[PDB]
Design a protein around this nucleic acid. Structure first.
Ligand SMILES: Nc1ncnc2c1ncn2[C@@H]1O[C@H](COP(=O)(O)OP(=O)(O)OP(O)(O)=S)[C@@H](O)[C@H]1O
Ligand SMILES: Nc1ncnc2c1ncn2[C@@H]1O[C@H](COP(=O)(O)OP(=O)(O)OP(O)(O)=S)[C@@H](O)[C@H]1O
Ligand SMILES: [Mg+2]
Ligand SMILES: [Mg+2]
Lengths: 292, 319, 282, 289, 439
DNA sequence: GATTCGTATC
DNA sequence: GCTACGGCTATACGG
């Protein structure tokens, strides 16, 4: 085989793949395989993209015999992959041992599960085969704890929230405010995060050059909540969520969910586009309600 | 870089004074705007003659600053199911927004002809419940698609096709604003091709300016084509079969027009053909229907159209 | 037409669990169920007349008192009742002992459409709270009862597999093997495999394949045996396997599948049979 | 103008349950702000049931009311407004994993507030994790109608425990059962939740007749004065019963519900009491003698 | 500031635009329905929009409910847009009916179902049917009076599919209620007609004189009479007429007067195709407007069958056989075009031309009727059931496979004759299958 | 739109 | 501290 890997911590893989459940339930999923590991890149309507980073140290039998190309790309379905990694590996005495396999172009993506009592082989046929913010024009940068952001996202989901807004304004007195203004059936809904360092660990607002820390001006982000709710399940296991947005209307979410002692967690990168916001008077009401 | 609004939206009127065409209807809309007591209304007519922009301008001049949270514009692009109508329309109608003594909230329902019947009944209930605070404006192409109980509470305003003079006036305003070279023959050709459609006239003018510059008959007729209903009408009204066959070939077959399009256009023209007898009209309708059946079943060659023309001429000159 | 019975869950655990499992199975299968009250056994039937049939046999010794009298042959009282009302009554009666009690459940046929007067007692803590219920039922006619019969199974190619008891070491592993195919959302057909002992769950489709296999020890009570069945019936089979220690699986080549459950009360043994037709042909 | 804040877990629970039940009675909840209490009531579309919840001044730890600044005079000032039940019940809910340390409700109908707060109810929630979430639901001022049935009924009296009644009512299903028959014998009290049967053309069955019954002796009945059969609906009784035990107060020892009815025609009074909450339910009874 | 049809609503029964006979036989039905033992359980009102269906019930409830109410005024209108938290949408009407059933003694209130629940979804429509069926068949000793008002309007085409149902084509009582509800002993139906010209003119004159200063200021008082007559002539809707009059009065220019266009009925369209239409001597224009405004009715096989059934009523059948042959030949030709619009256009045009060419003054036409094809289909279904019985008994007592074709040809008549003599001279089926063939 | 019967009005 | 079960929610089905 051109690639082979075996793992025993199937719960981590299950949660990592379930982070993609908020996206398309039954669509395609594209997989890179290289020496560093394997990644799952998923895009929806060219407006939002998620990406996993399952490191090599997470697996204990990562081989990657491929030499013709630096990476191997395969496109398969995601739902049956989730059901395959949904073993839950119960009965701690006899741990289920997965075995991912791929033998280059034309071969199925095999997922062998061994229990020493039950043998299951799942093969998936592969199919025929962007949203990145520039690291120079960042408008604001925030580091929020995962629990608070997940609670805010869940509350926004529970109130409808057809549209959502992002507020990021720094002040000269070292006071930072971060709120999520929402359009819904209720009207104007806001969820402002605390200014303490336990939750809002860092909040820096720039002048579109990522260097000058400017104060007194607010960064506005108009995002469709259908794309915003895609990150809700990712933040559930996140320990610290890193928020970044440039002036080009691209929001990048860095999920840092810090089992093997060497692998550095699972890296989830979510990139999201910003709504055009043709109505110029909406932001006026946003800042008017923010000032009060 | 590519940043230039198309002339259709770059020159969209923002006030009721810039809308040409139905002078009486625009005057009535101005009177409503200056009075404030706007009733429930239904606006119908041909596409691109100033229905949506008239309603938007009326709402803008009727609410002004309160337009942001005093109107609710729902269209076919947005979901308009019975649940959506129920929730959103009931919440917007119940909202107690302070307004001038003669001012009311406006619920603009564009493309009302494509709304489900249950949503129409929910709209009936909402109108009967909250008629004293909000008013409903309907924009549609035909008023028959709106159910009779909804039309009972609405004042129907019908928009006629734009005349050549009003189209010429608006076009000349656009030339004077953009300062492009033009020829009177070219403007006449643009009006002739537009066929009473203002948006089509603007699109054709913009294409002519952006592709050739000076707007004459030659450039316009080299970028845009003459309306095929008129060509089909000329083909059907030919005296002898040879001329009709030559027109059909050299104007629809060499130009790249599908046979099914020709048959449908012939049916429409025969439906709206004057100076012909009823028996002749129904015989040509029957022949066009037989040809349509033959085209639909798979035989879509030029021979079928030639035979249709031959039978039409045979019935025209009798036997 | 005098039917009356008394059920005590605490006095006899195993047969009460059998009755509860039968009620749960007939409720999960489809609405309404057929209760055939023969003078020596009670048979609970769920006849959809491709979809499976459940034929459970409950002996008269299960209940504390089994007076069954009717003008029909062998005092055969056949009735159709909604499972949901009976299931709710049984859940209430189960919670009655769960909160702490030992009261009996008295059932009488009180008046073609009739109702059962399922009444029992409950004591909170030394208070008397009488729980009275009336489940509307219809009385099936004698000929209509004759139109319902247990489908016989041919033994020309049918082969038996003695599935391991769930109380044994391999029971939990076999239960996991059975439910290993239930975790897939987009599955509608399971194609079984037995060659002559292995049980293989094969789900072959356009662009994905599944090869669940059982490597543990198995017994066949005393050649390939393939039958493809729907996933919903397999869920019922998994539910029946968990509640029964003695479970027997019978596979017919491209004909049918039989899930036999037996409760050794020894005494007449209570048995549950779930006949399943093949969803489609191999 | 009006400001009330809840800073207790049980008080928030009972407030949320009352709001949810008033939403399940009618799509819009009517709230009247008095200078002594906050009354939240809801009337059915058919005007066959009525439930009112009175949160006294002791319920909140501040009740700053400034009627001088909808506004009604009866003197005591009364301010009433109409709010959406579903919108209000999705605000007062308790988030999972996050504890509401403060629930403040206010409406500042003064010249100080802008149009963004004019005719907008102000509710502010502060979680234990210091996250502040506040909403601005739309409200509509209305006129309050003080229907007098509590003074008119103060006919037999029934005071039974709410625990077994809660168990029996919650065990019922409103989909298959839609009717309550509360018969009291000179010894026993029996409440049965049944449904009448409808016969078709040729003596068919348009609807079945399921009768789930329950009978209780006189010793469990805390107080009874015959001074009798009454029939009414089921769902409203279920919700009004489930309102009460939401505020778990083991130190408080009421746990009962008081009943009042005179004839099959006149409505039945249904009352439970809390430290700072008075709960009343009115239901039109079945007039069939 | 208020709409004229709202600020000039009737305050008593005398101001309601309704015929004297209609008022009388609605009053009698409502008074009989308030009796302790009423033969009629519910009242069904059907008619076009704006025919004073809803308001007359209100004014009657203002005088009937306070009289029959016990001692210890308006209607209890169903409101469909109410979304209760613990209420599935299909259960809203059931909860409303169960709550409103408690309005008999000392709580008496008429029940007015003006806006029905969502009947365009089939599940809730069947729920509505079986819910109002239980009300009629209820064993309740006494129930509050129920009034259901259904507006007869034609549902415009929305989606393209040939699974269109009765409710999808038109919104009428026949499409909503099934045969059991409509043909029920405890159901009284009072169909309504559009408001006549006389009441419309009288009420428009009353509204005009109620605002005399505003028309005299705009000098429109002298021109009010022709406007009133023209509006009353165009439409029969009181609400549309009042709205149009308000629009004309509040105007300050020469905007032409326009009102909503009522749809043409099935028999109205049949008469228009057969006998033509007055004030329009151009057949092409009339046919074009009929196809543009009533395409849903015209584009149906029921209309061609109606023309075939009713074309002989032009002169009681007194016309040349050549015209009839031409009409039926054209219809047969149109039947082979697979439902193309050209087929309907050609058929209607040929029928109209044929009837126009032979039209003469003094003609005494006949009465048109609905096609009998549904009766033929029912008879064919009965024949199918009897033939299935014959094939079952012939395949159970013995082994004999006969085809349904042979059953209809020979075994439908010969075999009953064999079973007749065999039985009388001495199997189950003795009568001719489907009955005898007469004439 | 057509026929047939019954009223209100001129 | 772990498991079972009830409530909430997302998805497929039906007419
Ligand atoms: N009377 C008019 N005067 C000036 N511009 C007009 C007029 N009517 C249409 N237009 C132009 O047409 C474009 C938009 O027309 P719309 O009013 O949106 O079309 P419409 O009349 O609403 O038809 P539909 O049914 O919505 S496609 C803009 O570019 C307008 O400037
Ligand atoms: N003299 C009058 N007679 C009758 N209705 C009047 C009169 N003056 C004003 N109206 C109004 O005209 C409207 C007529 O509505 P109705 O016909 O009663 O309702 P409807 O019969 O249900 O019609 P739909 O089907 O609901 S559109 C009401 O809003 C009345 O208030
Ligand atoms: Mg438009
Ligand atoms: Mg009405």
């Amino acid at each position: 085989n051109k690639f082979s890997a075996s793992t025993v911590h199937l719960e981590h893989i299950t949660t990592a793949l379930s982070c993609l459940t908020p996206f398309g339930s039954k669509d395609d999923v594209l997989i890179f395989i290289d020496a560093d590991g394997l990644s799952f890149v998923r895009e929806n309507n060219h407006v939002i993209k998620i990406q996993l980073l399952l490191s090599r140290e997470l697996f204990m039998s990562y081989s990657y015999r491929n030499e013709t190309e630096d990476h191997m790309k395969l496109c398969v379905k995601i739902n049956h992959i989730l059901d395959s990694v949904s073993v839950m590996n119960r009965n701690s005495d006899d741990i289920v041992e997965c075995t991912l396999s791929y033998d280059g172009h034309g071969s199925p993506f095999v997922l062998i599960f061994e229990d020493s009592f039950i043998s299951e082989r799942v093969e998936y046929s592969t199919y025929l085969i962007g949203l990145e913010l520039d690291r120079e024009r960042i408008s604001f940068e925030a580091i929020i704890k995962g629990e608070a952001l997940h609670s805010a996202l869940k509350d926004l989901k529970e109130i409808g929230c057809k549209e959502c807004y992002v507020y990021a304004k720094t002040e000269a007195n070292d006071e930072n405010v971060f709120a999520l203004i929402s359009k819904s059936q209720l009207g104007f809904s806001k969820i402002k995060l605390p200014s303490n360092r336990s939750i809002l660990e860092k909040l820096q607002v720039f002048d579109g050059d990522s260097t000058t820390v400017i104060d007194g001006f607010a960064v506005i982000g108009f995002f469709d909540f259908t794309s915003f709710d895609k990150i809700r399940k990712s933040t559930k296991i996140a320990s610290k969520v890193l928020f970044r947005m440039d002036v080009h209307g691209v929001l990048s979410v860095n999920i840092l969910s810090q089992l093997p002692k060497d692998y550095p967690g699972i890296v989830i990168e979510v990139c999201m586009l910003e709504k055009e916001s043709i109505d110029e008077a909406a932001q006026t009401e946003i800042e008017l309600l923010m000032e009060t | 870089l590519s940043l230039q609004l198309p002339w259709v939206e770059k020159y969209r009127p923002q006030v009721l004074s810039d809308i040409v065409g139905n002078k009486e209807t625009i005057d009535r809309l101005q009177q409503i705007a200056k009075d404030g007591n706007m009733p429930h209304m239904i606006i119908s007519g041909m596409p691109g003659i100033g229905k949506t922009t008239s309603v938007h301008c009326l709402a803008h001049e009727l609410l002004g600053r309160s337009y942001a949270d005093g109107v609710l514009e729902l269209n076919a692009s947005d979901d308009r199911g019975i649940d959506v109508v129920r929730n959103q329309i009931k919440h917007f109608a119940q909202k107690k927004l302070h307004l001038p003594p003669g001012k009311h909230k406006i619920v603009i329902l564009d493309e009302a002809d494509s709304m489900t019947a249950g949503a129409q009944q929910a709209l009936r209930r909402t109108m009967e419940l909250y008629s004293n605070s909000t008013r409903f404006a309907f924009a549609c192409n035909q008023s028959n698609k709106i159910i009779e109980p909804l039309q009972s509470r609405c004042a129907i305003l019908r928009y006629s096709k734009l005349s050549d003079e009003d189209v010429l006036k608006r076009l000349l305003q656009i030339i004077k604003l953009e300062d492009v070279k033009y020829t009177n023959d070219g403007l006449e050709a643009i009006i002739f091709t537009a066929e009473g459609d203002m948006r089509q006239a603007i699109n054709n003018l913009q294409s002519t300016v952006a592709g050739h510059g000076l707007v004459n008959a030659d450039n316009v007729f080299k970028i845009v084509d003459s309306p095929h209903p008129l060509i089909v009408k000329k083909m059907l009204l030919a005296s002898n079969l040879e001329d009709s066959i030559q027109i059909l070939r050299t104007d629809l077959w060499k130009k790249g027009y599908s046979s099914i399009d020709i048959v449908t256009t012939s049916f429409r023209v025969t439906k709206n053909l004057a100076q012909v007898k009823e028996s002749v009209r129904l015989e040509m309708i029957k022949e066009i229907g037989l040809t349509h059946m033959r085209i639909l079943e798979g035989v879509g060659t030029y021979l079928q159209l030639a035979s249709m023309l031959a039978k039409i001429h045979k019935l025209n000159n009798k036997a | 037409m005098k039917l009356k019975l008394i059920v005590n869950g605490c006095e006899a655990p195993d047969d009460y669990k059998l009755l509860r499992t039968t009620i749960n199975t007939v409720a999960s299968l489809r609405k309404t169920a057929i209760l055939r009250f023969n003078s020596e056994r009670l048979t609970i039937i769920s006849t959809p007349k491709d979809t499976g049939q459940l034929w459970c046999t409950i002996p008269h010794d299960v209940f504390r008192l089994y007076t069954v009298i009717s003008a029909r042959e062998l005092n055969t009282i056949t009735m159709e009742c909604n499972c949901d009302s009976l299931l709710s009554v049984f859940k209430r009666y189960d919670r009655v002992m769960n909160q702490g009690s030992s009261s009996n459940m008295t059932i009488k046929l009180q008046s073609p459409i009739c109702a059962l007067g399922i009444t029992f007692e409950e004591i909170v803590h030394n208070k008397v709270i009488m729980h009275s219920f009336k489940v509307p039922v219809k009385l099936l006619f004698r000929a209509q009862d004759t139109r319902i019969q247990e489908p016989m199974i041919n033994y020309i190619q049918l082969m038996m597999y003695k599935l391991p008891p769930i109380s044994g070491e391999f029971g939990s592993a076999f239960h996991g093997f059975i439910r290993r195919v239930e975790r897939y959302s987009n599955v509608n057909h399971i194609h079984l495999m037995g060659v002559k002992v292995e049980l293989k769950i094969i789900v072959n489709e356009l662009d994905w394949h599944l090869e669940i296999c059982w490597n543990g020890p198995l017994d066949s009570v005393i050649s390939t045996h393939e039958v493809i069945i729907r996933c919903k019936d397999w869920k019922v089979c998994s539910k029946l396997y968990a509640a029964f220690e003695e479970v027997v699986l019978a596979i017919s080549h491209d004909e049918s599948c039989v899930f036999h459950c037996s409760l050794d009360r020894g005494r007449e043994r209570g048995q549950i049979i779930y006949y399943i037709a093949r969803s489609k042909g191999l | 103008s009006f400001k009330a804040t809840i800073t207790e877990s049980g008080k928030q629970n009972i407030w949320f349950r009352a709001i949810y039940v008033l939403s399940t009675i009618q799509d819009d909840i009517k709230i009247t702000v008095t200078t002594n209490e906050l009354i939240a009531w809801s009337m059915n579309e058919t005007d066959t049931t009525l439930c009112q919840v009175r949160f006294q001044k002791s319920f909140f730890e501040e009740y700053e009311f400034k009627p001088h600044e909808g506004v009604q005079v009866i003197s005591h000032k009364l301010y009433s407004f109409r709010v959406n039940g579903r919108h209000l019940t999705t605000i007062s809910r308790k988030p999972d994993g996050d504890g509401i340390k403060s629930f403040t409700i206010a409406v500042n109908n003064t010249s100080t507030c802008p149009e963004s707060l004019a005719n907008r109810l102000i509710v502010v929630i502060e979680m234990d994790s210091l996250i502040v979430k506040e909403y601005c639901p739309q409200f509509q001022p209305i006129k309050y109608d003080p229907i007098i049935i509590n003074l008119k009924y103060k006919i037999n009296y029934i005071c039974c425990n709410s625990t077994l009644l809660k168990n029996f009512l919650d065990n019922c299903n409103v989909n298959v059962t839609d009717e309550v028959k509360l018969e009291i014998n000179v010894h026993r009290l029996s409440i049965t939740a049944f449904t009448k049967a409808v016969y078709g053309k040729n003596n068919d069955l348009l609807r079945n007749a399921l009768s789930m019954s329950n009978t209780i002796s006189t010793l469990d009945l805390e107080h009874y004065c015959l001074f009798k059969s009454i029939i009414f609906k089921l769902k409203d009784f279920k919700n009004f019963i489930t309102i009460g035990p939401s505020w778990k107060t083991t130190q408080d020892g009421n746990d009962n519900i008081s009943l009042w009815f005179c004839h099959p025609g006149d409505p039945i009074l249904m009352q439970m009491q809390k430290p700072g909450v008075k709960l009343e339910l009115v239901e039109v009874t079945d007039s069939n003698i | 500031g208020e709409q004229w049809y709202e600020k000039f609503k009737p305050n008593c029964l005398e101001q309601v635009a309704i015929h004297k006979r209609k008022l009388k036989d609605v009053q009698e039905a409502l008074d009989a329905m308030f009796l302790p033992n009423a033969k009629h359980r519910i009242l069904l009102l059907s008619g076009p929009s704006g025919c004073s269906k809803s308001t007359v019930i209100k004014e009657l409830s203002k005088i009937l409910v306070p009289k029959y109410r016990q001692n210890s005024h308006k209607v209890t209108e169903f409101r469909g847009d109410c979304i209760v938290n613990d209420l599935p949408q299909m259960e809203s009407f059931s909860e409303f009916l169960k709550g409103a059933r408690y309005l008999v003694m000392s709580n008496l209130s008429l029940i007015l179902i003006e806006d029905l629940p969502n009947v365009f979804h089939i599940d809730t429509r069947r729920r509505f049917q079986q819910l109002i069926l239980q009300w009629l068949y209820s064993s309740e000793p006494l129930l509050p009076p129920l009034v259901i008002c259904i507006t007869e309007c034609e549902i415009p085409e929305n989606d393209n599919n040939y699974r269109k149902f009765g409710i999808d084509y038109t919104f009428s009582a026949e499409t909503i209620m099934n045969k059991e509800i409509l043909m029920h002993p405890r159901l009284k139906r009072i169909k309504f007609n559009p408001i006549n010209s006389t009441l419309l003119k009288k009420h428009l004159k009353f509204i005009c004189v109620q605002n005399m200063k505003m028309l005299k200021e705009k000098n429109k008082w002298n021109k009010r009479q022709e406007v009133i007559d023209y509006i009353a002539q165009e439409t029969g809707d009181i609400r549309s007429a009042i709205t149009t009059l308000q629009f004309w009065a509040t105007s300050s220019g020469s905007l032409p007067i326009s009102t909503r266009e009522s749809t043409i009925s099935y028999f109205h369209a049949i008469g228009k195709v057969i006998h033509g239409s007055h004030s329009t001597n151009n057949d092409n224009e009339m046919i074009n407007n009929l196809f543009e405004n009533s395409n849903n009715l015209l584009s149906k096989e029921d209309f061609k069958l109606g023309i075939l059934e009713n074309y002989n009523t032009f002169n009681k059948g007194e016309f040349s056989i050549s015209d009839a042959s031409s009409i039926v030949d054209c219809l047969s030709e149109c039947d082979n075009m697979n439902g193309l619009p050209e087929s309907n256009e050609y058929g209607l045009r040929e029928v109209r031309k044929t009837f126009r060419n032979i039209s003469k003054q003094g003609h005494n036409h006949g009465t048109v009727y609905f096609p009998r094809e549904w009766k033929v289909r029912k008879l064919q279904n009965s024949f199918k059931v009897q033939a299935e019985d014959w094939l079952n008994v012939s395949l159970y007592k013995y082994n004999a496979v006969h085809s349904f074709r042979n059953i209809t040809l020979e075994f439908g008549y010969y075999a009953p004759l064999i079973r007749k003599c065999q039985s009388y001279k001495k199997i189950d089926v003795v009568d001719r299958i489907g009955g005898p063939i007469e004439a």
